[PDB]
């Protein structure tokens, strides 16, 4: 009669005694309890969302502006010879949302100077995604759509396709400062979206600056390159051999 009465003291005793081998330290987890240290993206994930409600005060409004500049312009410095004061004032009374102010910054000449002129168009699309959306591009469907939209409808419509998009509507919306969110699994992505955001993001200290030795070359078209247009590699090989043998 193992335990007729209510008290379970033997079962609990043996359960506790056997739980000891279950909590033994595993193989190792020094760099594994945070794989973000391998990603080197701890700060971006632990940087909470910054918002601007309707009744907001002076405090953190400067903080909201600092977060906006640090996101939109990368870690690249922005001298107050470049900060648009009129846009900030238009934001202060809520005449424009944070989305509208970000549209303004995207259409300033500082944003263009940094990301549009010294760069190609692939790099421009990658940076537009990484800054105004938080994620890397997924495939050349996005690149082709955005490049055609640029050449056909101007930089204005090109940036609007990022700002007034559906994705920007849910994930950030009117009053949320964009954050790097491709590190966490975002629904409906390729496994290369995370890899692309990891490749674009070199660290908390680094930035995607125009004024460096490399001249701000593309980081990801090499990464995004193979899957889209290298399915026809095998037959193109026979075509190239046939051309060579002539």
């Amino acid at each position: 009669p193992v335990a007729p009465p209510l008290e379970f003291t033997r079962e609990a005793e043996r359960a506790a005694w056997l739980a000891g081998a279950l909590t033994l330290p595993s193989s190792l987890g020094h760099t594994e309890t945070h794989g973000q240290e391998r990603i080197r993206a701890v700060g971006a994930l632990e940087a909470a969302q910054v918002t601007l409600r309707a009744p907001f005060t002076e405090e953190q409004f400067q903080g909201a502006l600092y977060a906006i500049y640090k996101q939109v312009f990368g870690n690249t410095y922005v001298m107050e010879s470049e900060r648009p004061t009129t846009a900030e004032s238009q934001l202060k009374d809520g005449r424009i949302t944070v989305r509208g102010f970000i549209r303004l910054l995207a259409k300033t000449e500082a944003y263009k100077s940094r990301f549009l002129y010294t760069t190609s168009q692939n790099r421009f699309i990658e940076l537009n995604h990484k800054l105004l959306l938080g994620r890397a591009p997924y495939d050349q469907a996005e690149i082709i759509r955005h490049l055609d939209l640029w050449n056909s409808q101007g930089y204005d419509a090109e940036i609007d396709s990022y700002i007034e998009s559906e994705e920007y509507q849910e994930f950030f919306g009117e009053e949320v400062v964009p954050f790097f969110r491709g590190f966490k699994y975002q629904v409906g992505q390729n496994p290369l979206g995370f890899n692309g955001l990891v490749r674009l993001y070199d660290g908390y200290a680094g930035s995607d600056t125009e004024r460096n030795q490399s001249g701000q070359v593309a980081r990801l078209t090499d990464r995004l390159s193979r899957p889209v247009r290298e399915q026809s590699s095998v037959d193109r090989i026979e075509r190239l051999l046939r051309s060579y043998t002539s």
Binding site: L24, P25, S26, S27, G29, E32, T33
Partner: peptide, 10 residues
């Protein structure tokens, strides 16, 4: 070893 402390799934 996944579920015990120091394991990947822990």
């Amino acid at each position: 070893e996944l579920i015990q402390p120091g394991g990947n799934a822990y």
